[PDB]
Amino acid sequence: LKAQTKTEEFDAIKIALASPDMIRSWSFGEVKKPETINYRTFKPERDGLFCARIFGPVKDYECLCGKYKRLKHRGVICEKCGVEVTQTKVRRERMGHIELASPTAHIWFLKSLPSRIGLLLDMPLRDIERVLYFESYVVIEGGMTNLERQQILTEEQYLDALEEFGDEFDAKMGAEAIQALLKSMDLEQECEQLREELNETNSETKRKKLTKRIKLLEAFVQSGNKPEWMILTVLPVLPPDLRPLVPLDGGRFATSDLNDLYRRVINRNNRLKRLLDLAAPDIIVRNEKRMLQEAVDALLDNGRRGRAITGSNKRPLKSLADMIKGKQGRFRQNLLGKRVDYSGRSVITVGPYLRLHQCGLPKKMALELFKPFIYGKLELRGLATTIKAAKKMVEREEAVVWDILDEVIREHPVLLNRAPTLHRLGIQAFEPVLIEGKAIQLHPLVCAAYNADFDGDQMAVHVPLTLEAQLEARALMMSTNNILSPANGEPIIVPSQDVVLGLYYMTRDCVNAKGEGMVLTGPKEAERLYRSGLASLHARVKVRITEYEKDANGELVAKTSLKDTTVGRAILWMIVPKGLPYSIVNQALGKKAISKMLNTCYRILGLKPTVIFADQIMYTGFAYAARSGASVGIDDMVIPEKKHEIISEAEAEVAEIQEQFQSGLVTAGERYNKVIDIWAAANDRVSKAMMDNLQTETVINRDGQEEKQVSFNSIYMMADSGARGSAAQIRQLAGMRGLMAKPDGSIIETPITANFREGLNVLQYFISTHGARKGLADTALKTANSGYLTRRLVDVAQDLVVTEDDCGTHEGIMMTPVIEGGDVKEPLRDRVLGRVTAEDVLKPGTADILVPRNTLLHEQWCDLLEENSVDAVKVRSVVSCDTDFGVCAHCYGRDLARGHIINKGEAIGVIAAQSIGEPGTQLTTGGLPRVADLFEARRPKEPAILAEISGIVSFGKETKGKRRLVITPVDGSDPYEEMIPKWRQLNVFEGERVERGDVISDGPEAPHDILRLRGVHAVTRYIVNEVQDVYRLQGVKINDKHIEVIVRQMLRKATIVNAGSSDFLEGEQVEYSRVKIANRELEANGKVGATYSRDLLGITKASLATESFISAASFQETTRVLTEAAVAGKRDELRGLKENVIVGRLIPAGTGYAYHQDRMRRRAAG
Amino acid sequence: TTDPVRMYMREMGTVELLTREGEIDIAKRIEDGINQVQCSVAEYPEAITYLLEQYDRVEAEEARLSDLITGFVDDPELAREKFAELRAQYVVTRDTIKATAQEEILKLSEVFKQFRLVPKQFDYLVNSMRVMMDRVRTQERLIMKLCVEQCKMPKKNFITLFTGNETSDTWFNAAIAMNKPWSEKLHDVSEEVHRALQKLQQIEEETGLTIEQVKDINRRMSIGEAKARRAKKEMVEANLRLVISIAKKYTNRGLQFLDLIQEGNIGLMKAVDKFEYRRGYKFSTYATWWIRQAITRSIADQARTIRIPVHMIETINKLNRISRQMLQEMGREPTPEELAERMLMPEDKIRKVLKIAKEPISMETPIGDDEDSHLGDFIEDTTLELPLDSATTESLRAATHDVLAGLTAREAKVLRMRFGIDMNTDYTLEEVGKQFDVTRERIRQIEAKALRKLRHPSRSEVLRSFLD
Amino acid sequence: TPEEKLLRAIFGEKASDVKDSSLRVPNGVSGTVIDVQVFTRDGVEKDKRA
Ligand SMILES: [Mg+2]
Ligand SMILES: [Zn+2]
Ligand SMILES: [Zn+2]
């Protein structure tokens, strides 16, 4: 079969230098004139920047002169003025060129930081410019006379050398010279010479530059680029419509800046041509050549020399490099981010009646959004004669169209989005419910995932047009299909505030209430007792209940008994489906327990029952909360009776310590700490006074004198249930609030003795202001900081996706409880949950396999491990996975919005970065910058040092600025001696043996060491445990998985040590390398396989290296990326996410993973 | 420091300003140089005979007097009789070549030197000479390379019998029998050399000069040309400072500084070309007008994004002038029609002229928020077609195509013919008559019923909804 | 185009040489007109209403 010669569907892309003839291929004519439009008839002047002959017809299918106006005539080139009549779209396509008199340097290859022309010729930059400006002569192909090949000469010297040697010596100046140098250059011969010299001399200064240059040369040879192409003969002109002159209102015109630039390049060029036929003196044509050089530079990339300014406007005109460039790099898919049809937006409201899978949609919005569907549906059933009549119908808003819209809305999900999108839950699919009014209604249970308050936040709607988008939205992005945070398996649909206050007030008990002590057959007549007003919602009562336990084999057992409970719990039991025990609702049902209810329900009955369950909880919560009549009055906040007295006693302490400072018994500094300390203790006292009083002071009577239970006071119920408020905020309401801090960071020794229930005076409020302003500032700044972190994170991971099924390695990390100094700052069950065992684990006895080799550990397995005393489990991690260019699902884990093991093809990198980034707002060394330091690997300020090698060590030489430490291994060779400055207090015992990786001093240690000395598993454990400390100290739950994938991307690269295939010190992919020595281990050389050393690269550094240049061209510096790629002729195969988004095809993951796979195998095949 | 403004000022500053005496020296040199080429042109027979053959075309109405001579030293009658003089001196000198000729060949030049040629004509002559010398060089290098390189003969002995002859067979056929080591080798290539000698000896027939003189003449010409350019260049290099001083006036007129001084430099080049020192006009103030002329004349043409004719530019300037005084003179500013009476023209043209005179605004002008929103981002495409429309076009085809299948095959054909429906162009009702063989009014009747059949609704309810 | 020409032929409508730029009330906003102003270039005849 024949491959093709026309439009099929391309794969990859290639980039390289452009030949003058290659540039001429694109050009459909030479622009010979600066003229744009005629100035009266606005038609394009022929042979000008805007030309119908060269580029294209002004109007669709019509000749310029007007001879052929008929749509039939198409391939006709008009005989008067040649214009092939074709759609005006081709004026946006066809390019052009300009033939330059003198050669010209391409600014991108001259001024790029590693100047390409400079290091290709092994010539300095300042010299090349000195030659380009005609400020000196340079030798070329010197022959055997007096002179170096690249030597630079002056006026007299060139003259003297010419009198001495007339011929067999040649020198030029200007652009023609550099082009002559590059053309004469034979790269192959230069390569050979450079290889020998590398071997001979050993110096870091020499061979660093040496190896860099040799790589460039051999790359450039294989590239196919010929050095001459760095000097421009022909200059392409951009199609006219991409820099349009289009008219405006009032008859004014507006045009792109490129024209002003392009115009210039023509004129000077043309002038130079004229100046050749006039035989001008050297001093002029040289100046003209320089001017042409300056003009071309300004066109390509402006700002690397003079920053030329546009006509009549100070602002420098934007050039082609600035069109690609920007913030950041390519706006074509940078923030922000292109406009999209079939969308809308508005303020959002509640709609508690909604099921969790739907949302209220404004009528008008749905009409304008589905307009084409409505048109198509109207004439399918025949309610509209034709599409026009259908338009007129919906534009008339005839009553009949509303029913057709209910049809097209029914099964057709819509996408909802909020402003700060962080994790994937920022967009969720809902079923449209037609709603009168202009406001969007959003299911309350989802308000947690969006972080959307109702204080006027707006949301955007998107219509999923194609069928695949409907099924993607329904089966992936649907609300009910993500009920669980991807960061941790806990439900993110957890009831928020009003609902949880309802259930708290529902299952609670007072001491004596209507119906106390009686007995009822079942919840049905329990509700009947309550609703009729006979029995109180909370009263201790025995009722017969039937609970269920599925503890049989896939089978629901039933058992009935008399449970001691309240009326509310009895009524609530009606909601709990089937196999859940009554024990879960028999408690007080706070916000914490009410979440684990939904969680257990999900981990037991599955998905579907949990959804309907969640809905019911919301509905019953709102209803019963409304019945409860909860409110907040001014008398709901009870101040301690002893407050003023505590203040007075605390006031005596300060006057006691003050008297000690007047008499000098205590120093000034000691005083400050002292006074501040007594006030702090006082705050705790008032806090723990009002807390006792507020919490238990309801003191009530059942048949006797008194008794006391937890208070039914409104504000306490709010804080206790978990709805809203906390001991800190409550403490500010009743007890005194804090000790504020003056701007410099000190804390004022006269705290705020009043609170919000009382008045704050002038001073207290003024002092409070700083805390407020720093809070708002800190949050608004930490918000921005958080976002930036997620950027770096998604940049360094991204393309990481689950690819293989099982890589099949026994390798993994040891998962133990965090066990910090006390008992269990976090258990083992949470660390190992949802992960897979590396190898079978023992009972205390053995030949008894509890968990068999690699098995997903679910709730039953974790409880079975807890029954037994097992303290340690080794677990497979994404960092040790043997699969190259991805992670095997067997090594990852189950975690998802669903409880099943991770699917094949889900993109884990994005969700990992998102899971880490979203909570970063709540963080505050210590804080979010501490996290950033960790992921960046940065060596600390005053680091420790670890023993390089095991064996007995001692101190050697003397004080030069380092007092050397000499290590003596038992069997092995001694020679390691490290230079340690001795003015840093040591730890390591001068007479003791230290294992490699021991403590030779104190202070933090660089993770580079821990990777190098202790090993990969050690450093990954260090990162995860340290970063998890920061988040968990703030109360953020993030599973260790995501952190582990970030770590794997950090160590992606390693530096070879030995040889036998590739170069010695090259940093290179451990995927590539390991796959290369595993391929080399057999066949090839018997084993020549080379040893490497795993490396630790910071996230921002490791993200720098990416095979695809289109991806790199996005977030990095565009110019450098494009040049550095363009010289080597690098061929981008796509294969990644970022690049495919730019080019606009299916992402090689998720739904698209099937396609790319099917395409990837078709490639490199027959 | 780059910034080409600097590398010019410092590059030109080396050339030392000319003394008032030095100018005349260079100008004297110029006179010598050109007159050398003029005399060298006067010494070419074909240059004369060509001029003769050209004037014979002028009197035959095959050309015009303006395309040949610019006048002599010191009218159709005067031209005719002067050319007769040239022709007269030509026809004597031609036959006297039988040694003594030189005295008359010298006089033929003198009359010919009175003719001031049109620059176009003169260039073609010199070109013909240099092209003729290329024609001579072709044969010179052929006969040389066919001996030295091919047949292995030294150049040392090759030039002995060449100089002075290089035509007859004295060198070719009489030097091969000399029995030198290079002698017997010349026979192999003889066939190829002697046949190529035709054009070599033919040049002396056409041009009427032996290969001897042919080198000398245009060599002297070459020297003069070189001297000319040498002196003229020299003058220009001295006067760059004047150009710099003049261009400093036109800075903000909308062209770059170096653009100005370069166009002005071109003016100075022309100034040297047309300068005659015998008139006593200082070279500074003579070049100033030309340089100043070049600057302004250049600024008018290329300095705008929309090129405007000169009178338009001057008109615009004239308006500014009035607006200046009248701004404060009137205390407000002249009304849009105020400057109109002051200006000559129809005076309503102020609006039109004032509009096209405006310079277009940069499409990258940032507007608002400082955000990447730029003026160009807000300009919608008006040449596109909305899909909600395109959809109705594709439907209307199916519509008219459906309703045209509801009629008789001839009504469908006749209506598809009378309009461009699925066919190239459309056909006049007379054309339709010729295609159907039943012609004129007959066909027209059918059309009515066709339109009539779609008019009264069964058909009509579907097609009526397209008009709004 | 051909079929538009047939359409006008059947319904006999003369397609105007002037296109309609008239200002019409934005979609959805509804109110009462409380005032009207007409500014005219000097020299163009003010219409009736003006
Ligand atoms: Mg808000
Ligand atoms: Zn034409
Ligand atoms: Zn794996």
Side-chain angles (χ1 to χ4, degrees), chain B residues 273-310:
Chain B
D273 273 46
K274 271 192 160 55
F275 182 51
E276 297 170 314
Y277 75 111
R278 308 143 102 255
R279 201 172 295 99
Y281 287 174
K282 188 182 180 175
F283 182 74
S284 309
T285 346
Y286 175 62
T288 291
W289 181 92
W290 277 98
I291 297 169
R292 201 159 49 82
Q293 129 79 350
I295 296 183
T296 306
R297 180 59 170 79
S298 170
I299 296 179
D301 228 358
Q302 64 194 193
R304 315 253 309 182
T305 16
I306 26 161
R307 177 159 68 89
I308 49 184
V310 186

Coordinates of all heavy atoms in Angstrom, one line a residue, chain B residues 273-310:
Chain B
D273 N 26.5 64.0 -8.2 CA 26.4 63.6 -9.6 C 26.0 64.8 -10.5 O 26.5 64.8 -11.6 CB 25.3 62.5 -9.7 CG 25.8 61.1 -9.5 OD1 26.6 60.9 -8.5 OD2 25.5 60.2 -10.3
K274 N 25.2 65.7 -10.0 CA 24.8 66.9 -10.8 C 25.6 68.1 -10.6 O 25.3 69.2 -11.2 CB 23.3 67.2 -10.6 CG 22.3 66.4 -11.5 CD 21.0 67.1 -11.3 CE 20.0 66.8 -12.5 NZ 19.9 65.3 -12.7
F275 N 26.6 68.1 -9.7 CA 27.3 69.3 -9.4 C 28.3 69.7 -10.5 O 29.0 68.9 -11.1 CB 28.1 69.1 -8.1 CG 28.8 70.4 -7.6 CD1 28.1 71.6 -7.5 CD2 30.1 70.3 -7.2 CE1 28.8 72.7 -7.1 CE2 30.8 71.4 -6.8 CZ 30.1 72.6 -6.7
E276 N 28.4 71.0 -10.7 CA 29.4 71.6 -11.6 C 30.0 72.7 -10.9 O 29.4 73.7 -10.5 CB 28.7 72.1 -12.9 CG 28.1 71.1 -13.8 CD 27.3 71.6 -14.9 OE1 26.5 72.6 -14.7 OE2 27.4 71.1 -16.1
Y277 N 31.3 72.6 -10.6 CA 32.1 73.5 -9.8 C 32.4 74.8 -10.5 O 32.7 75.8 -9.9 CB 33.4 72.9 -9.3 CG 34.4 72.8 -10.3 CD1 35.6 73.6 -10.3 CD2 34.3 72.0 -11.4 CE1 36.6 73.5 -11.2 CE2 35.3 71.9 -12.4 CZ 36.4 72.7 -12.3 OH 37.4 72.6 -13.3
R278 N 32.2 74.9 -11.8 CA 32.6 76.0 -12.6 C 31.7 77.2 -12.4 O 32.0 78.3 -12.9 CB 32.7 75.7 -14.1 CG 33.5 74.4 -14.4 CD 32.9 73.6 -15.5 NE 33.6 73.8 -16.8 CZ 33.1 74.5 -17.8 NH1 31.9 75.1 -17.7 NH2 33.8 74.7 -18.9
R279 N 30.5 77.0 -11.7 CA 29.6 78.1 -11.5 C 29.8 78.8 -10.2 O 29.1 79.8 -10.0 CB 28.1 77.5 -11.5 CG 27.0 78.5 -11.8 CD 25.7 77.8 -11.9 NE 25.6 77.0 -13.1 CZ 25.7 75.6 -13.1 NH1 25.9 75.0 -11.9 NH2 25.6 74.9 -14.2
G280 N 30.8 78.4 -9.4 CA 31.0 79.2 -8.2 C 30.0 79.0 -7.1 O 30.1 79.8 -6.1
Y281 N 29.1 78.1 -7.2 CA 28.1 77.9 -6.1 C 28.7 76.9 -5.1 O 29.2 75.8 -5.4 CB 26.8 77.2 -6.7 CG 25.9 78.1 -7.5 CD1 24.8 77.6 -8.1 CD2 26.1 79.5 -7.6 CE1 23.9 78.4 -8.9 CE2 25.3 80.3 -8.3 CZ 24.2 79.7 -8.9 OH 23.3 80.5 -9.7
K282 N 28.7 77.4 -3.8 CA 29.3 76.7 -2.7 C 28.6 75.3 -2.7 O 27.4 75.2 -2.8 CB 29.0 77.4 -1.4 CG 29.7 76.8 -0.2 CD 29.4 77.6 1.1 CE 30.1 77.0 2.3 NZ 29.9 77.8 3.5
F283 N 29.4 74.3 -2.5 CA 28.9 72.9 -2.5 C 27.9 72.7 -1.4 O 27.0 71.9 -1.5 CB 30.0 71.9 -2.5 CG 29.5 70.5 -2.6 CD1 29.0 70.0 -3.8 CD2 29.5 69.6 -1.5 CE1 28.5 68.7 -3.9 CE2 29.0 68.3 -1.6 CZ 28.5 67.9 -2.8
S284 N 28.2 73.3 -0.2 CA 27.3 73.1 1.0 C 25.9 73.5 0.7 O 24.9 72.7 0.8 CB 27.9 73.9 2.1 OG 29.3 73.6 2.3
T285 N 25.7 74.8 0.3 CA 24.3 75.3 0.1 C 23.6 74.7 -1.2 O 22.4 74.8 -1.3 CB 24.3 76.8 0.0 OG1 25.6 77.3 0.5 CG2 23.2 77.4 0.9
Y286 N 24.4 74.1 -2.1 CA 23.8 73.5 -3.3 C 23.3 72.1 -2.9 O 22.2 71.7 -3.3 CB 24.8 73.3 -4.4 CG 24.3 72.6 -5.6 CD1 23.1 73.0 -6.3 CD2 24.9 71.4 -6.0 CE1 22.7 72.3 -7.4 CE2 24.4 70.7 -7.1 CZ 23.3 71.2 -7.8 OH 22.8 70.5 -8.9
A287 N 24.0 71.4 -2.0 CA 23.6 70.0 -1.6 C 22.5 70.1 -0.6 O 21.6 69.2 -0.6 CB 24.8 69.2 -1.1
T288 N 22.5 71.2 0.2 CA 21.4 71.3 1.2 C 20.0 71.2 0.6 O 19.2 70.5 1.1 CB 21.6 72.7 1.9 OG1 22.8 72.7 2.7 CG2 20.4 73.0 2.8
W289 N 19.8 71.9 -0.5 CA 18.5 71.8 -1.2 C 18.2 70.4 -1.6 O 17.0 69.9 -1.3 CB 18.4 72.8 -2.4 CG 17.1 72.8 -3.1 CD1 16.1 73.7 -2.8 CD2 16.7 72.0 -4.2 NE1 15.1 73.4 -3.7 CE2 15.4 72.4 -4.5 CE3 17.3 70.9 -4.9 CZ2 14.7 71.8 -5.6 CZ3 16.6 70.3 -5.9 CH2 15.4 70.7 -6.3
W290 N 19.1 69.7 -2.2 CA 18.8 68.3 -2.6 C 18.6 67.4 -1.4 O 17.7 66.6 -1.4 CB 20.0 67.8 -3.5 CG 19.8 68.3 -4.9 CD1 20.4 69.4 -5.5 CD2 19.0 67.7 -5.9 NE1 20.0 69.5 -6.8 CE2 19.2 68.4 -7.1 CE3 18.1 66.6 -6.0 CZ2 18.5 68.1 -8.3 CZ3 17.5 66.3 -7.1 CH2 17.7 67.0 -8.3
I291 N 19.5 67.5 -0.4 CA 19.3 66.7 0.8 C 18.0 67.0 1.5 O 17.3 66.1 1.8 CB 20.6 66.9 1.7 CG1 21.8 66.4 1.0 CG2 20.3 66.1 3.0 CD1 23.1 66.8 1.7
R292 N 17.7 68.3 1.7 CA 16.5 68.7 2.3 C 15.3 68.2 1.4 O 14.3 67.8 2.0 CB 16.5 70.2 2.4 CG 15.6 70.8 3.5 CD 16.1 72.2 3.8 NE 16.4 72.9 2.6 CZ 15.5 73.6 1.9 NH1 14.3 73.6 2.3 NH2 15.9 74.3 0.8
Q293 N 15.5 68.2 0.1 CA 14.4 67.7 -0.8 C 14.2 66.2 -0.6 O 13.1 65.8 -0.4 CB 14.8 68.1 -2.2 CG 14.7 66.9 -3.2 CD 13.3 66.6 -3.7 OE1 12.3 67.1 -3.2 NE2 13.2 65.7 -4.7
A294 N 15.3 65.5 -0.5 CA 15.2 64.0 -0.3 C 14.5 63.7 1.0 O 13.6 62.8 1.0 CB 16.6 63.4 -0.4
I295 N 14.9 64.3 2.1 CA 14.2 64.0 3.4 C 12.7 64.2 3.3 O 12.0 63.2 3.4 CB 14.8 64.9 4.5 CG1 16.3 64.6 4.7 CG2 14.0 64.7 5.7 CD1 16.9 65.4 5.8
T296 N 12.3 65.4 3.0 CA 10.8 65.7 2.9 C 10.1 64.8 1.9 O 9.1 64.1 2.2 CB 10.6 67.1 2.6 OG1 11.3 67.9 3.6 CG2 9.1 67.4 2.7
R297 N 10.6 64.7 0.7 CA 10.0 63.9 -0.3 C 9.9 62.4 0.1 O 9.0 61.7 -0.3 CB 10.9 64.0 -1.6 CG 10.5 63.3 -2.9 CD 9.1 63.6 -3.4 NE 8.9 63.1 -4.8 CZ 8.7 61.9 -5.1 NH1 8.5 61.0 -4.1 NH2 8.5 61.5 -6.3
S298 N 10.9 61.9 0.9 CA 10.9 60.6 1.4 C 9.8 60.4 2.5 O 9.0 59.5 2.5 CB 12.2 60.1 1.9 OG 12.1 58.9 2.6
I299 N 9.8 61.3 3.4 CA 8.9 61.3 4.5 C 7.5 61.3 4.0 O 6.6 60.6 4.5 CB 9.1 62.6 5.4 CG1 10.5 62.5 6.1 CG2 8.0 62.7 6.5 CD1 10.7 63.7 7.0
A300 N 7.2 62.1 3.0 CA 5.8 62.1 2.5 C 5.4 60.7 2.0 O 4.3 60.2 2.2 CB 5.7 63.1 1.3
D301 N 6.3 60.0 1.3 CA 5.9 58.7 0.6 C 5.7 57.6 1.6 O 4.6 57.0 1.7 CB 6.9 58.3 -0.4 CG 6.3 58.0 -1.8 OD1 5.0 57.9 -1.8 OD2 7.0 57.7 -2.7
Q302 N 6.8 57.2 2.3 CA 6.7 56.0 3.1 C 6.5 56.1 4.6 O 6.4 55.1 5.3 CB 8.1 55.2 2.9 CG 9.3 56.0 3.4 CD 10.6 55.4 2.9 OE1 11.7 55.7 3.4 NE2 10.5 54.6 1.9
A303 N 6.3 57.3 5.1 CA 6.3 57.4 6.6 C 4.9 57.1 7.2 O 4.7 57.2 8.4 CB 6.7 58.8 7.1
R304 N 3.9 56.8 6.4 CA 2.5 56.5 6.8 C 2.1 55.1 6.6 O 2.6 54.4 5.7 CB 1.5 57.5 6.1 CG 2.0 58.9 6.0 CD 1.3 59.8 6.9 NE -0.2 59.7 6.8 CZ -1.1 60.4 7.4 NH1 -0.7 61.3 8.3 NH2 -2.4 60.2 7.2
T305 N 1.2 54.6 7.5 CA 0.7 53.3 7.3 C -0.3 53.2 6.1 O -0.6 52.2 5.6 CB 0.0 52.8 8.6 OG1 -0.2 54.0 9.4 CG2 0.8 51.8 9.3
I306 N -0.9 54.4 5.8 CA -1.8 54.6 4.6 C -1.1 55.7 3.8 O -1.1 56.8 4.2 CB -3.2 55.0 5.0 CG1 -3.2 55.7 6.4 CG2 -4.1 53.7 5.1 CD1 -4.5 56.5 6.6
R307 N -0.6 55.3 2.6 CA 0.1 56.3 1.8 C -0.9 57.3 1.3 O -2.0 56.9 0.8 CB 0.8 55.6 0.7 CG 1.5 56.6 -0.3 CD 2.6 55.9 -1.1 NE 2.0 54.9 -2.1 CZ 1.7 55.3 -3.3 NH1 1.8 56.5 -3.7 NH2 1.2 54.4 -4.1
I308 N -0.5 58.6 1.4 CA -1.4 59.7 0.9 C -0.6 60.5 -0.1 O 0.6 60.8 0.1 CB -1.9 60.5 2.0 CG1 -0.8 60.9 3.0 CG2 -3.0 59.7 2.8 CD1 -1.3 61.6 4.2
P309 N -1.2 61.0 -1.1 CA -0.6 61.9 -2.1 C -0.1 63.2 -1.4 O -0.5 63.6 -0.3 CB -1.7 62.2 -3.1 CG -2.6 61.0 -3.1 CD -2.6 60.6 -1.6
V310 N 0.9 63.8 -2.1 CA 1.6 64.9 -1.4 C 0.7 66.1 -1.2 O 0.7 66.7 -0.1 CB 2.8 65.4 -2.3 CG1 3.6 66.4 -1.6 CG2 3.7 64.2 -2.7

